[PDB]
Amino acid sequence: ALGGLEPGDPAPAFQVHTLDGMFVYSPRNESGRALIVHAFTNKSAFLECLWTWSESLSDLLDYLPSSTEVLMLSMDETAEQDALWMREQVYRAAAHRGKEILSRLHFSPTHVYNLGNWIPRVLYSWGCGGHNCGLGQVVFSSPDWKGPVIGKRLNARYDWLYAHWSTDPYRLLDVGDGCAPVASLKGAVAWVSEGGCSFFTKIKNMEKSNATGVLVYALPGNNIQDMNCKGDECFTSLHIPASMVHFQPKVKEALQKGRPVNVKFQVTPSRSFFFGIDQRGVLSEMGWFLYPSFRFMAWQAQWFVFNDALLEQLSQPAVTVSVFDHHDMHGNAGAHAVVDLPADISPYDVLELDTSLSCPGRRDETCAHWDHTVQLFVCCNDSSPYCNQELGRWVTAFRRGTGHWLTDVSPLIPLLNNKKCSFTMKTAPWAMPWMTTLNLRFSQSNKTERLYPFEVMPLFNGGTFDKDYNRRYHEITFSIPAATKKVELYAVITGHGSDDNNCGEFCVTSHYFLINRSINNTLVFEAAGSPLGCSLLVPKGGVPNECGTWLYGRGGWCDGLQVDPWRRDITSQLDMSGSNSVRYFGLFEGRDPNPKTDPGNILMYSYLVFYQ
Amino acid sequence: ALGGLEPGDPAPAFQVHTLDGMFVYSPRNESGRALIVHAFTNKSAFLECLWTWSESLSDLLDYLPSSTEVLMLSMDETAEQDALWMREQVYRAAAHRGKEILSRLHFSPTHVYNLGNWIPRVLYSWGCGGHNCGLGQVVFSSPDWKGPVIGKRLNARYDWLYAHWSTDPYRLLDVGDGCAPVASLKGAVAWVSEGGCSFFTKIKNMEKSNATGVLVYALPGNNIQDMNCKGDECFTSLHIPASMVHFQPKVKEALQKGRPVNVKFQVTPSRSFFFGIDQRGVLSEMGWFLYPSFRFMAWQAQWFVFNDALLEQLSQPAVTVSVFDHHDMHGNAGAHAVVDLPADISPYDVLELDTSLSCPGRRDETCAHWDHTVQLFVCCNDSSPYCNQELGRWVTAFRRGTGHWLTDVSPLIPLLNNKKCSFTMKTAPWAMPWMTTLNLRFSQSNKTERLYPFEVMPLFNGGTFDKDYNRRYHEITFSIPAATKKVELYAVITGHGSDDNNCGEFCVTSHYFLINRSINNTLVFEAAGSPLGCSLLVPKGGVPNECGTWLYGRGGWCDGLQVDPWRRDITSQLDMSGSNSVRYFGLFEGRDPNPKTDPGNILMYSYLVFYQ
Ligand SMILES: *[C@@H]1O[C@H](CO[C@@H]2O[C@@H](C)[C@@H](O)[C@@H](O)[C@@H]2O)[C@@H](O[C@@H]2O[C@H](CO)[C@@H](O)[C@H](O)[C@H]2NC(C)=O)[C@H](O)[C@H]1NC(C)=O
Ligand SMILES: *[C@@H]1O[C@H](CO[C@@H]2O[C@@H](C)[C@@H](O)[C@@H](O)[C@@H]2O)[C@@H](O[C@@H]2O[C@H](CO)[C@@H](O)[C@H](O)[C@H]2NC(C)=O)[C@H](O)[C@H]1NC(C)=O
Ligand SMILES: *[C@@H]1O[C@H](CO)[C@@H](O[C@@H]2O[C@H](CO)[C@@H](O)[C@H](O)[C@H]2NC(C)=O)[C@H](O)[C@H]1NC(C)=O
Ligand SMILES: *[C@@H]1O[C@H](CO)[C@@H](O[C@@H]2O[C@H](CO)[C@@H](O)[C@H](O)[C@H]2NC(C)=O)[C@H](O)[C@H]1NC(C)=O
Ligand SMILES: *[C@@H]1O[C@H](CO)[C@@H](O)[C@H](O)[C@H]1NC(C)=O
Ligand SMILES: *[C@@H]1O[C@H](CO)[C@@H](O)[C@H](O)[C@H]1NC(C)=O
Ligand SMILES: *[C@@H]1O[C@H](CO)[C@@H](O)[C@H](O)[C@H]1NC(C)=O
Ligand SMILES: *[C@@H]1O[C@H](CO)[C@@H](O)[C@H](O)[C@H]1NC(C)=O
């Protein structure tokens, strides 16, 4: 019944009533605007802050694409008033700003249990149970009270306090504002009031007072806020959890009486608050929301656009060779396959890889909970140096299986020196299983002065980022073959791990390919270490709304995205008729690395390509 | 997260608050009382009638086992009052009756969105979308009204009106009581008021007035009722649908004004209203509810008991041989396998078959929507008559995959005359795929005077139930081998199809095995044709709450249950030293069948077994 209501299936047509009229969705054979259906409920402080926080509304008005529509439903019994409240909030935010986006926003006062469509089934069956998704509740219990008092809570920013609450009951002690250290609480959760001083200061003072946790209650008539640091506050690390709730007269009266009070934290599973329909009418999951900002939706929308632009590229003329079709990957072997390439790949001067790393199930919940590198090695002649050489590199997403990327690896065509070859896609041995689908697309460029690769010589590999990292690399002297018109450097470099300086994965590390000991060739990961360095690559293929730190700018790569190779032309630098020398070296802050604890890692694959 | 929350997985421990105290469920290594969790919502007239209809409460108080517990939650915002209302209704029903059952009923005033447990996830993810499950709603729309009016509706009894509503909009005409024929409505749904005359009379008069449907509105302050016939009314067949709703002043005022009024019918998907935990802590689906009566729960509970009693039997000492392990079945081939039986099965005088017919997925929604016969044939020597002979017969359930039966087929042991044999489980070729798991259990009986079968001779087969049915059967003359102490008749007979007399599947047909033309041997399907003939076999293995007419008493079989063979001893009738004659014949009402239209079918497999 109702057809397929799982990710990847088409979205059946439907009709809804809204303050502006009848909103009708009908599948089309063409590509149109993507849709985002959002279900709002007053029982979650996450959505309340989403719709009340000015930053979230500004992000929605600014970063939302111009080719996306949003529909809002209310699962609460006050849907009629809830829709009007949301519309008023949006209009007030858009005041003295753009107003075209309003035409793409629709608010349905209809009750969820009266739609008469397939939407409630999707909302119920697409349960999130993850980051900032799932009603977080706080239960206050006292012997005097005949029953508990249940309220909403919003956990602090994921990037500030990594400590998590425990299901075991806690105590509760009144500490007023909480920004002045007290004698001691003896492992009793603090009951503090927002305002007066800083939030970070409150948490720090409570931790210094021997407190297992803190609970900020908003003053009457106020709203919950997202707890986060500001500059100097973030360097300091706090090892206790915290959350913000509303004000309850009962707990205050009990504390004044001196009666014991206990507090418990729970996560009640809820219904999906977001689900998207792609530009082609395909149902898609919107991932997780790390913190209450509408930006997470916009990024998802951006991805949809890219996906469409991707699906148009694959439809173009090209010779397709399928290597993997949902082939399972896990362990050392990973995914091994053997293919028979066309008889003659010489005319094809362009080679691309279309890759899709999905999970065993359609839903994202059945995916790996970590990001692990993936490498594609190719072997066509064991008696040649090209065997087991890396052809492409990718990075998995945090519990997402919608990844679909296209990478240009044309200069590595000479590695395929045999009509029959073997391809091995490998990841971390201890990684959870994945399902890889890979296709090689051969094509001829539109360039008039077409050039064809004929030789690929590996230059240097990676290694541990230690003080001896640059001591293992020696100058390579090579002579250029005749009938050569162009020389290129093709290097795939990625830093991993953390050290005293958080280097490797979050390091601004420079890599130099000195040529003829006379000219530099620099690759720098400037975006590394930035809070949102990897958030700008979603239009380019990055998978957004991942269950992890997918926003941090990494060194040379990003989560849920292929590693775009670094290609440089050095035909001018080299002496086309004579010998040349090349030497690699990596540096940090302009000096060799000196990691005293937990040294990082550098995975590199470098090649020198000669064109006819 | 939350472990496995699908059918067949264990139920994690949990705690809930109720008017009587703290209800705690903790898995145990032993077997205890089964549990039934029911979610109630005021938005469904089905549950409202369930909790307001006296018949349903009486059925709950009478047929509910004494080893079952029921917990009730309310998904509505009035849970506190809803639980008290349910408790008051139950107590009033139990007045002047038994009160022990009350100790096994618990009512939780806690809101569903505040449980803090795994129950809401199951309720949301176990969507029903089927018979009398899924909010049936009626939408009244008029040009004068700025918005539609949505109300609850309860479709008439499934066994009375098979006509179904259409998603297309209808009209609405006021016809008062509706038990007096009018001029004509011209394909306009009738708007009638309950009371004054009979419901069947109202529907008949409306159909005679050229009406596409009828809608009964209950008087203000009244409640919806289940539409059904009474004796003479049921013989007559009506080809239009009908439903009962509440009274709306707006539609009445509009009709008085003469303004056009349109009515539409929809089915909004909802959350699961019932889910059960077996005696061993395994989550189990409760199937569908054909009409609003609590009996459907009780039957399910009964099944649980049987299941436990079944699982204890399998744990007993026995030689187990697995033939199928979730082997797929579909098409003509069905499921074919080859097994190597023990070296010597002579000492094992008892042979049983443990069978489980599940679906491709754990959920019942992925199951076949029809009941189809299943037969197990065995071949051990192509040069022997025993090849391709039937060993066991089963009947699938309407969209249920919890079937697990144990059938005694010991007299058919001689069919296994070779250590290696081939087993073929076959169903209707056009049937949806199933997954069969079969095990043969050999055991030695506790009887002191043990007897061992050594010869099985087929006697007669089935055929089409026509006037020539008995003309194709001739007397079989057989001589008994020496060293024989007992002779048995083992016949598996099943009627199928319908005819002018509804014979075959719903026929009281007698089968006679005349022996030596001197003594009868009668098998009669007395329960055939009864409304609840097959409802009494749930404790014996019948799968209850099927998506079909599983309550009707069939001829010699029942839905979701094995066909228990008919075994009779005739050692006295036969001349142990001499020849004997046997002749089969089937009769209806004491006479040969004379089906003028759509003749039925009789599937029979008969054997004469000789014991040492
Ligand atoms: C190739 O570059 C290296 C490294 O210099 C880096 O880039 C410079 C522009 C500057 O930012 C340095 O701090 C970087 O480390 C050159 O060798 C180094 O040159 C620097 C001065 O630029 C000197 O202090 C170091 O001792 C040199 N050696 C090292 C770092 O090992 C090199 O000269 C460049 N090649 C050329 C210009 O042909
Ligand atoms: C075996 O039974 C048949 C069938 O009789 C049936 O059972 C009877 C008790 C009675 O209910 C009949 O109406 C049933 O049909 C006997 O043969 C028939 O006997 C009936 C009278 O009982 C007679 O009218 C029929 O013509 C007979 N023949 C038929 C129905 O084909 C038969 O005699 C029985 N065998 C015995 C007693 O040894
Ligand atoms: C969402 O729920 C919160 C929490 O109940 C509501 O917050 C209330 O807001 C009103 C209006 O400012 C205050 O008077 C109350 O004191 C607040 N707390 C309560 C009622 O507990 C909030 O209004 C709700 N939002 C919507 C749109 O209904
Ligand atoms: C379930 O919903 C129905 C339909 O709304 C309620 O029926 C109402 O019952 C009251 C009390 O007898 C009447 O006064 C109303 O006229 C009825 N119809 C309405 C309100 O539309 C019924 O009470 C509800 N049950 C519970 C337990 O809340
Ligand atoms: C916290 O407890 C520790 C236990 O070792 C104690 O040394 C310390 O002084 C306490 N700090 C307070 C009460 O601020
Ligand atoms: C590998 O290359 C060598 C080069 O001498 C060639 O002789 C050999 O046949 C090649 N092997 C295959 C399997 O193509
Ligand atoms: C119903 O319509 C049919 C159309 O053939 C007509 O013959 C019949 O008289 C009508 N019956 C009524 C209006 O009762
Ligand atoms: C079948 O039975 C016959 C009886 O003569 C015997 O000769 C033959 O070997 C048997 N076949 C098998 C496969 O057991």
Author numbering:
A (entry chain B), B (entry chain A): 51 to 662
Which text from the study accompanies this structure?
Peptide:N-glycanase (PNGase) is a deglycosylating enzyme acting on asparagine(N)-linked glycans on glycoproteins. The other is called acid PNGase and is found in fish embryos; it is active at acidic pH and is believed to be of lysosomal origin. In this study, we identified the gene encoding the acid PNGase, which we named Ngly2, in zebrafish (Danio rerio).
The structure of zebrafish Ngly2 was determined by cryo-EM, showing that it forms homodimers and that its substrate is accommodated in the cleft between the protease-associated domain and PNGase domain, where the catalytic residues are located. The other region, spanning residues 186 to 318, is identified as a protease-associated (PA) domain, showing structural similarity to domains found in certain peptidases. Ngly2 homodimerizes primarily through interactions between the Tx-like and PA domains. Its overall structure is nearly identical to that of PNGase F, and the catalytic residues essential for the enzymatic activity are conserved in Ngly2 (Asp421 and Glu555) (asterisks in Figs. S2; 3C). In contrast, Trp59 and Arg61 are replaced by histidines, His422 and His546, respectively.
